[PDB]
Symmetry: C2
Subunit: 342 residues, 2 copies
């Protein structure tokens, strides 16, 4: 059999790029393939996600079309990342509190999915990647698709969604009152959750797929136009010594370089594995650098009209063009996936 994973990296409004590309793909299937009420989340056996990619993954698994999620994201993007706090980062504010507030993000997630939906009422398998800053171990909020691992059953989807999106500096750690633990962003370990998703499909989801091999797994890793993040050599040369706050810019650069490094490492591991089995074709990634953007101005948070317009245009153009040429992006949506019964 064929197993399809939908990996969604996390980048903030670059998540809006991700959801715009997904919605455009949905509309393309609706038009060309002659379908009605098509959801982009019904064609995948597992929907992995991290940070806002994880929020979108939970939205897709809960049974909502990518277009409704895109509308909610468009409505709530400026609320999640207000310019009032974006322009007043400085350092005398970052020392007393984190950037932004969890409440606008919480309300955005509540609008997207809801508040009373739990992992036990989901018809599709989903991962949420997070770091549990109370035991020191990462926490993977997955659906009860493995009988040996059936916790998170009584955990609301919004709790996991806020856990994965809590960037260490850009937000505050999310308190899950059920477990009496706090959680941080999943990008601290896996900003590209394709590799851990493949591992889960191979060794965890074995009741659903007893005969699972790497050669029969297809991953659709929708990037966030932030793969090639780096620190510009100018601020490095001017701050590699003591550092006039530009190196490790109140922890923002620590977090961003960490997430970029783990994403690169996991992508490297996945590509090397697929080349080892000569299944390099099985990995489909949609991510291209913006031609007008240098690889240093990539920000986790930018709700300005220009950045949102660039993300929207890139998503639409990339979706249309990749569906036109990339045969595998079309092949991903030939057949629907089978819902899982816990």
């Amino acid at each position: 059999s064929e197993i399809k994973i939908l990996s969604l990296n996390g980048g903030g409004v670059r998540g809006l790029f991700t959801i715009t590309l997904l919605a455009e793909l949905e509309s393309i299937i609706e038009k060309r393939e002659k379908c009605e009420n098509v959801k982009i989340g019904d064609y995948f056996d597992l929907i992995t996600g991290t940070s806002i990619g994880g929020i979108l993954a939970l939205g897709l698994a809960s049974g909502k079309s990518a277009r409704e999620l895109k509308e909610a994201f468009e409505i709530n993007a400026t609320k999640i990342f207000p310019l009032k706090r974006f322009k007043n980062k400085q350092w005398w504010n970052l020392l007393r509190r984190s950037i932004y507030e969890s409440e606008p993000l919480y309300d955005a997630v509540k609008s997207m999915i809801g508040e009373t939906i739990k992992f036990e009422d989901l018809n599709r398998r989903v991962m949420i990647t997070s770091v549990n800053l109370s035991t020191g171990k990462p926490k993977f909020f997955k659906t009860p698709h493995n009988p040996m691992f059936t916790m998170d059953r009584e955990i609301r989807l919004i709790d996991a969604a806020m856990a994965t999106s809590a960037a260490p500096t850009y937000f505050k750690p999310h308190y899950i009152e059920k477990l009496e633990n706090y959680f941080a962003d999943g990008g601290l370990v896996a900003n590209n959750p394709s590799y851990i998703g493949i591992r889960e499909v191979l060794i965890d989801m074995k009741n659903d797929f007893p005969d699972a091999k790497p050669e029969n797994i297809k991953v659709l890793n929708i990037g966030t136009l932030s793969e090639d993040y780096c620190i510009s050599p100018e601020t490095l040369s001017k701050n590699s010594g003591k550092g006039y706050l530009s190196l490790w810019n109140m922890g923002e650069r620590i977090v961003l370089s960490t997430m970029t490094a783990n994403q690169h490492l996991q992508r490297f591991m996945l590509l090397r594995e697929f080349e080892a089995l000569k299944i390099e074709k099985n990995y489909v990634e949609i991510d291209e650098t913006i031609p007008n953007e240098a690889a240093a101005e990539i920000t986790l948070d930018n709700a300005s009209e220009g950045c949102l317009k660039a993300l929207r245009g890139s998503g639409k153009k990339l979706a249309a063009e990749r569906y036109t040429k990339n045969e595998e992006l079309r092949n991903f949506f030939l057949k629907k996936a089978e819902p899982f019964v816990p």
Copy 2:
């Protein structure tokens, strides 16, 4: 065959435990097996490492016995992490410059391995993990044991050792003049290089081992008594949502939590793979815990006499017990690994 990998985690001062355990193992080998001039690094076909573990791995790969490295570390644990800078962190100091200086660490690394030795002069394969903050991609300083990857041939060992130990907020990023790039700690990507070490052996070390499987790989992953790191529940309950400077202690806690989470995730993946292939015996770990210290009290840069004594005693005791009972540890030092020739 039997491929043996010696992976050493990164803990800063807590590498004193690693080097003490290795030196004690050398001593027991000399006493029991009646050998003369034993180098603990002569029994492994690959010596990965990260941070101070990477420095120790470079020392062992350069041909030094673990006792010479232990003496050098005895002097340079105080000479590297001065009590003055460890007691003078506060908030207005770490705001301007990174704690400690790279020059004491550079002098220490020069004292152990040297300054004029490059990766092409080594007789044993070695990978050192680091994060390149100029391209944003992880950089694995490795010997030219694969003809396809050689660009580390003309790089001094001291440059790699200083790059892998440049813990963010703990040391300034290391500048390599040959590559015109800046590097950070390898614990951001892989604090436990055992998994990536096995990946390297399977996918890269194929010229020497064309027939490589997970079954014939044995990993001796020596920890640093810092696996069970976590944020104190009191600190979170006080200023997790509040986000005061205690939470994310000027990047110290961000980096430490990232190291702990990366180590946990990589160890979890390795253990899951070995359980899948029923080769759990292959992975040998001598990472115990200190039974007289809080989990949240694990620090990366505490070189006080009490902590050094605790690390030394733990290393000696663990070496004694694990040589007495663990037969795999004895199996490691049976036959010397053949040196590799480029």
